[PDB]
Design a protein around this ligand. Structure first.
Ligand code: CL
Ligand code: CL
Length: 162
């Protein structure tokens, strides 16, 4: 197990434009196209990212290609972030994966609001961090996924994904 398998489980795979849980157009493995309500807008964004006239449909290879780019960008975002980097650097690999999943789902902006939790993470206070993270819109909106990620943060193992 690695970050890629993990996120593939959490996000699934759809080759056609679809609305995610918040109702934003998305495609592939969690690739958000746009938050605007125009499907055209979306299609336009899609074509821009793929480099062709997709007509709202992509292949599996294309989806995986967007996915590689997206994972990479998320890691890089963490490293470039002054408050996150040190937390991330302080943790083992499994827990790092958990943080990348959060940033991938909610962006640097959303993750940005887990300060308190990140403090406890840095201090290796797992149980507490886990409890603090559950107090969030994130957990209330997408509880099953949140739970998986929280257990992974808490335990440092992949048990939630087995
Ligand atoms: Cl893109
Ligand atoms: Cl969920």
């Amino acid at each position: 197990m690695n970050i890629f398998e993990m996120l593939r489980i959490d996000e699934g795979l759809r080759l056609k434009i679809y609305k995610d849980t918040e109702g934003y157009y998305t495609i592939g493995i969690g690739h958000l196209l746009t938050k605007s309500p125009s499907l055209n807008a979306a299609k336009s964004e899609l074509d821009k990212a793929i480099g062709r006239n997709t007509n709202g449909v992509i292949t599996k290879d294309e989806a995986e290609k967007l996915f590689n780019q997206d994972v990479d960008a998320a890691v890089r975002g963490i490293l470039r972030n002054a408050k996150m980097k040190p937390v991330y650097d302080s943790m083992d690999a499994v827990r790092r994966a958990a943080m990348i999943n959060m940033v991938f789902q909610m962006g640097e902006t959303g993750v940005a609001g887990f300060t308190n939790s990140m403090r406890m993470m840095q201090q290796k206070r797992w149980d507490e961090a886990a409890v603090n993270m559950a107090k969030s819109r994130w957990y209330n909106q997408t509880p099953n996924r949140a739970k998986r990620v929280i257990t992974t943060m808490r335990t440092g193992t992949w048990d939630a994904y087995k």
